[PDB]
Amino acid sequence: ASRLYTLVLVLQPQRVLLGMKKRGFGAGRWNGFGGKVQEGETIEDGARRELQEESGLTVDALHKVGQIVFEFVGEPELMDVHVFCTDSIQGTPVESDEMRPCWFQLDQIPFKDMWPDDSYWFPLLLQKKKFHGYFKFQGQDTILDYTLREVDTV
């Protein structure tokens, strides 16, 4: 059994947009925009809503780029994160009570201030390859196991 989450990376030819999470789960780390998928909305719908909520941005089209399953030791539910990509954004990103958005050059991505798994799968995101990932965490900092592969269908 797993719970659905979304994650949205606005990835342009020279830069990626990230947000500093100000409260809640993952506070103090840069990440893409996303969160819990709600009852009554598609996964992509949930992805658009969290992007609008956390950055004010809306998007013409979202593209499926990956799926990452997380297990946390001692927690019965798995985290199933659907990762989306997009180039063209509508609007200017602005701080919310969840996220302080900033653009990053692609050689200055702050992996040390991100979730530790991102160092593993973000490269596949940059090569525009679809991927499936699995990470077993102890706490929120320690990866104990992981698998990562390229897929033809996310």
Ligand SMILES: Nc1nc(NC2CC2)cc(N2CCOCC2)n1
């Ligand atoms: N890039 C990334 N790495 C994560 N690592 C797992 C917590 C250990 C979680 C996560 N998000 C989870 C919540 O919804 C947004 C995506 N995003």
